[PDB]
Amino acid sequence: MREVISIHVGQAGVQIGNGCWELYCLEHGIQPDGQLPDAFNTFFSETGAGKHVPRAVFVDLEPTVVDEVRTGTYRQLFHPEQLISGKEDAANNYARGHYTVGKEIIDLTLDRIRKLADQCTGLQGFLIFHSFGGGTGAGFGSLLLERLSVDYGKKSKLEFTVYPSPQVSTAIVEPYNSILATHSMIDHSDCAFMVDNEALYDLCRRALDIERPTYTNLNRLIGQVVSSLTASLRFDGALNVDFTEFQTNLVPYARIHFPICSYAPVISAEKAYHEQLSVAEITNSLFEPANMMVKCDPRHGKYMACTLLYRGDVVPKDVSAAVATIKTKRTIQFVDWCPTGFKMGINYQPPTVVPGGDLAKVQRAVCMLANTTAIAEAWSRLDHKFDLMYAKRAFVHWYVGEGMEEAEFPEAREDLALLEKDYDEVAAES
Amino acid sequence: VREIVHIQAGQCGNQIGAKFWEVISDEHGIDPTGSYHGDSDLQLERINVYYNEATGGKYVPRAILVDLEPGTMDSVRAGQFGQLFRPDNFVFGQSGAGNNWAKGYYTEGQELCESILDVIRKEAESCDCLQGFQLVHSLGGGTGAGLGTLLLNKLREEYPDRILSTYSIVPSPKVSDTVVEPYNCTLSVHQLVESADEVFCIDNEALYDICFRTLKLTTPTYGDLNHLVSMVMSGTTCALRFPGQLNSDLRKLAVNLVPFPRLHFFIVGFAPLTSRGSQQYRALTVPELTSQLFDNKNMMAACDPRRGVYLTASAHFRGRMSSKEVDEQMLNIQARNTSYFVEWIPSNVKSAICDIPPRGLKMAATFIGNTTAFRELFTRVDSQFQKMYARRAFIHWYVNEGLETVEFDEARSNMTDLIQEYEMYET
Amino acid sequence: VREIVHIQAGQCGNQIGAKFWEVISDEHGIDPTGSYHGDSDLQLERINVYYNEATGGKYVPRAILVDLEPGTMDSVRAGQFGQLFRPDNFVFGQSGAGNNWAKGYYTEGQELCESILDVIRKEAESCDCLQGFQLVHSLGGGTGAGLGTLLLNKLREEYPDRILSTYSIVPSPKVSDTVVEPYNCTLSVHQLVESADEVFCIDNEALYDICFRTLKLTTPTYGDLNHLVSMVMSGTTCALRFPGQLNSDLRKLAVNLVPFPRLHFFIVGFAPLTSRGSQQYRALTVPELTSQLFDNKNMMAACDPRRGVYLTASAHFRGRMSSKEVDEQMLNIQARNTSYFVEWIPSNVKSAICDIPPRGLKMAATFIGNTTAFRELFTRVDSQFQKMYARRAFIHWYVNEGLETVEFDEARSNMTDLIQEYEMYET
Amino acid sequence: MSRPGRSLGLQFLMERRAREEANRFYNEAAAEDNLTRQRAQFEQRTLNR
Numbered sequence A: 001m002r003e004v005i006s007i008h009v010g011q012a013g014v015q016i017g018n019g020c021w022e023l024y025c026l027e028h029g030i031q032p033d034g035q036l037p038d039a040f041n042t043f044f045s046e047t048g049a050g051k052h053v054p055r056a057v058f059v060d061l062e063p064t065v066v067d068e069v070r071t072g073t074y075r076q077l078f079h080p081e082q083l084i085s086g087k088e089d090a091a092n093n094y095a096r097g098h099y100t101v102g103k104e105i106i107d108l109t110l111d112r113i114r115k116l117a118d119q120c121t122g123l124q125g126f127l128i129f130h131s132f133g134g135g136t137g138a139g140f141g142s143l144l145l146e147r148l149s150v151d152y153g154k155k156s157k158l159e160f161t162v163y164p165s166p167q168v169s170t171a172i173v174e175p176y177n178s179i180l181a182t183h184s185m186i187d188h189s190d191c192a193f194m195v196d197n198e199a200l201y202d203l204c205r206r207a208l209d210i211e212r213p214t215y216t217n218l219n220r221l222i223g224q225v226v227s228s229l230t231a232s233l234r235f236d237g238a239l240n241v242d243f244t245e246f247q248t249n250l251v252p253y254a255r256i257h258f259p260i261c262s263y264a265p266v267i268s269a270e271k272a273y274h275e276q277l278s279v280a281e282i283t284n285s286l287f288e289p290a291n292m293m294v295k296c297d298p299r300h301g302k303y304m305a306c307t308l309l310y311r312g313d314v315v316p317k318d319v320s321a322a323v324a325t326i327k328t329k330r331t332i333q334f335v336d337w338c339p340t341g342f343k344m345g346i347n348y349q350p351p352t353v354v355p356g357g358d359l360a361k362v363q364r365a366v367c368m369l370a371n372t373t374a375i376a377e378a379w380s381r382l383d384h385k386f387d388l389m390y391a392k393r394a395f396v397h398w399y400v401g402e403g404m405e406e407a408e409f410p411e412a413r414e415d416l417a418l419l420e421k422d423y424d425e426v427a428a429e430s
Numbered sequence B, C: 001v002r003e004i005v006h007i008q009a010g011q012c013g014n015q016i017g018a019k020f021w022e023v024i025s026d027e028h029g030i031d032p033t034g035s036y037h038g039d040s041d042l043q044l045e046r047i048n049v050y051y052n053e054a055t056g057g058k059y060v061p062r063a064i065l066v067d068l069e070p071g072t073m074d075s076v077r078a079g080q081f082g083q084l085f086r087p088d089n090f091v092f093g094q095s096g097a098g099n100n101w102a103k104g105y106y107t108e109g110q111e112l113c114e115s116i117l118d119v120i121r122k123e124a125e126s127c128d129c130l131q132g133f134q135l136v137h138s139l140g141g142g143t144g145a146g147l148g149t150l151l152l153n154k155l156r157e158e159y160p161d162r163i164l165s166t167y168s169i170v171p172s173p174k175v176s177d178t179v180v181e182p183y184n185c186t187l188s189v190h191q192l193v194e195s196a197d198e199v200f201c202i203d204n205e206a207l208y209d210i211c212f213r214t215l216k217l218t219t220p221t222y223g224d225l226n227h228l229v230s231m232v233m234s235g236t237t238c239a240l241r242f243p244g245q246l247n248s249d250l251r252k253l254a255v256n257l258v259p260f261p262r263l264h265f266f267i268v269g270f271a272p273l274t275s276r277g278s279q280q281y282r283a284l285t286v287p288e289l290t291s292q293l294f295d296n297k298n299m300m301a302a303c304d305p306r307r308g309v310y311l312t313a314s315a316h317f318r319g320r321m322s323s324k325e326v327d328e329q330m331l332n333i334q335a336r337n338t339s340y341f342v343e344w345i346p347s348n349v350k351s352a353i354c355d356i357p358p359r360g361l362k363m364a365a366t367f368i369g370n371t372t373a374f375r376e377l378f379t380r381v382d383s384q385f386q387k388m389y390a391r392r393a394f395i396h397w398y399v400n401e402g403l404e405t406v407e408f409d410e411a412r413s414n415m416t417d418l419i420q421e422y423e424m425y426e427t
Numbered sequence D: 001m002s003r004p005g006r007s008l009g010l011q012f013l014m015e016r017r018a019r020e021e022a023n024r025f026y027n028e029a030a031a032e033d034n035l036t037r038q039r040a041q042f043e044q045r046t047l048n049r
């Protein structure tokens, strides 16, 4: 009746794809063969008998990550044409993943996403996942959004990407790809979320009690956040939030859109039995810098808008009291030309657990997505790192040889400076 | 034979409408499948006001449900009364609401306008008489604030004589459900001032306070919060549906309470309200009822009357009661608190009596008043709007729909002048 | 129509009041569920004095309960006849049962008093008439003593005409429990003397002497001791509630017994009292009742009347009897014991008769008297307070809440003259 | 001019105190609702039941 389409790019995108859809099928009850032992039609299509199919497309430029899905347990659920794999990856090169290898497969994918759009009578929105440091995630991700911008126009293109960590890095060429991909993000993305791996590691150890995690555990934390966001579209609630509502309330400016994410309560299955976890308790926990999924302190900056999403036995009165109590704090700063600053959404379906899981059977939870000026701290670190490498021309030969003109390097640097100015200009007060 | 047509707009409107139809259906005694199994001949006297009869002993409400996204409608279908409504009266779009007034008014509002109007024409021109229409919507939203006002202008153009009574929910001052509310509220009020005859304002914060401090509900859900709204909306039309010692329909209310065409915004309040454990000890009488109505804590709108002055007041009573006792309290409440009434209008309290009370209550009363305390409500939105309007970027969401920035200035100027108009009639 | 408002304060007052309302509910025949289920029409003549009417035959007393923490009320809210009390009539603070008089009066009293006064105004301005109030509190404690005197001052300022008749429990002379009694009693006396019209002093040790001797009960519970007090409180107001040969209300009592504004402290007594085994053989007659009342051992205050002399006295009898028999005993008892009465006032004994006696007793008697024997009680607390103030470390606890050291001197200065005032009138 | 500065901050502290004392008074009413009106009735129901 109302549909959103999921697009996954890169190794992170495919690995996140398994992490989220394992929850969707389990939350809805679908056997991994597609049978049953509702909101089914928001995420799935029916093929007769009792067999369902997810509304998603997985794309990567190398077959290893995708073939795990093809050989995995969940192979029967997905449609063969949705899983698209290239021949050779971009090798952490934006230029390779945008012009040379990206254009070899772009038009094949655009048929499958558009063909999937035929079966959506009430399509409203896309979801796109990246890893900024990767080549296919940035190089091919930029080419995908530019086409989807003109193919469909005024359709919500929400993004949920993995920003580079403030210090943790797995690729040396990481600063180059992030800035170049940022230029493609700002003009085409309706709204793009941030998480970073370094903060997730700390949260997966402190609040949730695991000595040593893997990317699989981090993928399940991200899966919870996406579920809470989409719960309003799928399940009944006193206060539903559609995608188009979420676009207007959060972003104050065309280019300031970038929000940040948090989830509460995050607590081990052992210790979660120890507390009542009232609405006031969970609401307070979100606003601490320690719980943030992005390693930037909000106290350095200010808040521009906030959105709170509740999933459980959560009553409207105690939400308003809890949000009222937050405004009493004078460590939570707001730009005084933003007087209201909040949208609350309420859904009745409680959070769903997973076998072999890492969270508990909590009875009520809260999700938060807000825009803050503290993200200019993250942009500054990337900006300085890029300048040091570009001053001595540390890696230019690889990018130019792969079709990219060198004139794009100062353009992306200049465009980021405008974005930094926009955040500082918004931070001004009258 | 004074038929009234019912219109529900948006997520807020549909959920309010759903509970309200439960209340009347119980009152007349109509089963959720639509057939009468009541208990008295009186309930069939004037059921024609709200129900049409589909031959077969089935009654169909005179309701139209309007939304931009199908999510709200399907919840209504799954309810116990989903099958009651006529299927063709469900009019919905296939696009996101947007939570934006300009997009709701111009982008999706135009397309839905012609389809909805012909559905209204089917219900409007199906009855021997038509007193007026009845709209329920929210002002902080995008569909109810945007598309609701668009239909209100077209309804005025085609049916000037009929009473366009509206029930509105006003954005809350402390914590509110939407960020862009100052734009949505300001642009909507300009449309409401010139079009609707009667507008009732309700704030969600007061319902939280009344349910918690008075009704003693620890966890008041929207079901009980909407339940309070339904009693007031049922009480106003009670005179049409039932006999009484002194009748008073909508047009009597507008004539008496509205001294000038633009001062017609009202507050509402309902009595008696008692804790469902403490109800036994209350000696509920006529004087006890009057205490609750004029008490400032029972106002469903968060605008303390004591900070302003009253212009006109109206009281509705239901049940078998003394006419002398009812008339005496209007004297006493007016004389004891003369500091809170305008001197240049004597007899500021209107009264009416109805025979038949709601279920469970032997007697009940309803209050509607007009006061200058609404300057508090409009001050909050105007000051908040002024902060937001200097931050010009939020307007860009409205510019991408085609709204010209001068419309923001026109809306605020009309709204600002309305506050000044209430100031001068305080003197 | 002489409604009397019953105000209860503190740990001591609540326990007594629960027993007190238990007695009246049985006398009028009020079912513990709140409905009348009695046996006589005469009970319904003047039930307005202590009860309010609810449509449905449910009667709720005119009671106000005051304490600094709910825990004492929660025992009362539990208490057998608890359902009778109106739920909103319970006003308690958010602090402990602080025995410090200054803590109760200043820190927590001011917060509670404003809430308490409006609750009293609910009952005070609800009925046709209001003769006087009725306070039951303690003087050696902190909650009843401190806050009780604070409310008593503010009751006078708003209702000067009405009678401030209070029932107080006195610090025991041999062994009490709270160690700081001299401070709490002395500070309270200054508030009591000037504000209250009538004060009936009750000492536990006298109650601990009659239960042992007369009733012959080895373990009489706290209900038993409060039952003895509840008889006196019922007898005084019984003249209002029922017809009789010679009516005597509170205002009659104050005029006769009080010769001067500060000499109004009273000693109370009740008859008949008999061991529960020997009740069958007692030839209970009107002269037999007279013997118990004037017997020194039946006094409920440990202040021997033989030590001093009487100024005024009053006796109330209940039942259909001979008026000659009652009047002859007042002549007989007065002339036979002239050594204990003042020459300059003849006819020092007042009398009254009521038609209806209490349940179980064919006839009952109540005694209220005034004598210089109160000098013994105050000489106790005077000389005991003397050594208190020479070692001023205790004052710090009272100082921490703002009490100045001059208040101790001022409080002692007042009741020392009160002791002197009773001395000079003995001549 | 920092001592004027605290005068602004202190007045906002008083404003913050008064703004939240209204809510704390409402919270006190909520405590009265549960403890006084409801839970004292719970002790009423306790010895009744």
Ligand SMILES: Nc1nc2c(ncn2[C@@H]2O[C@H](COP(=O)(O)OP(=O)(O)OP(=O)(O)O)[C@@H](O)[C@H]2O)c(=O)[nH]1
Binding pocket: A009, A010, A011, A012, A015, A016, A060, A061, A089, A090, A091, A092, A093, A131, A133, A134, A135, A136, A137, A138, A162, A169, A170, A171, A197, A215, A216, A218, A219
């Ligand atoms: N949070 C999270 N990040 C991942 C995961 N897998 C990969 N990444 C991120 O991806 C980055 C490396 O890039 P790739 O995973 O190869 O993404 P790509 O765009 O496909 O790059 P290419 O393989 O060259 O095409 C790492 O720095 C990780 O931060 C994952 O499972 N979870």
Ligand SMILES: Nc1nc2c(ncn2[C@@H]2O[C@H](COP(=O)(O)OP(=O)(O)O)[C@@H](O)[C@H]2O)c(=O)[nH]1
Binding pocket: A238, B009, B010, B011, B012, B013, B015, B016, B097, B099, B138, B139, B140, B141, B142, B143, B144, B145, B169, B176, B177, B178, B204, B222, B225, B226
């Ligand atoms: N009292 C009450 N308010 C509601 C209910 N449902 C929604 N609202 C209010 O409606 C406002 C905005 O609703 P929205 O979804 O934007 O409706 P729209 O006008 O169609 O866009 C919010 O502030 C809600 O508090 C309800 O059932 N009861």
Ligand SMILES: Nc1nc2c(ncn2[C@@H]2O[C@H](COP(=O)(O)OP(=O)(O)O)[C@@H](O)[C@H]2O)c(=O)[nH]1
Binding pocket: C009, C010, C011, C012, C013, C015, C016, C097, C099, C138, C139, C140, C141, C142, C143, C144, C145, C169, C176, C177, C178, C204, C222, C225, C226
């Ligand atoms: N006669 C009688 N005395 C009591 C009762 N309850 C407490 N007391 C006495 O009252 C004195 C002071 O009690 P306290 O708790 O301080 O009462 P408060 O002044 O209201 O705080 C103590 O010495 C107790 O012995 C009762 O039910 N009956």
Ligand SMILES: [Mg+2]
Binding pocket: A010, A011, A060, A061, A062, A089, A090, A134, A136, A137
């Ligand atoms: Mg890849």
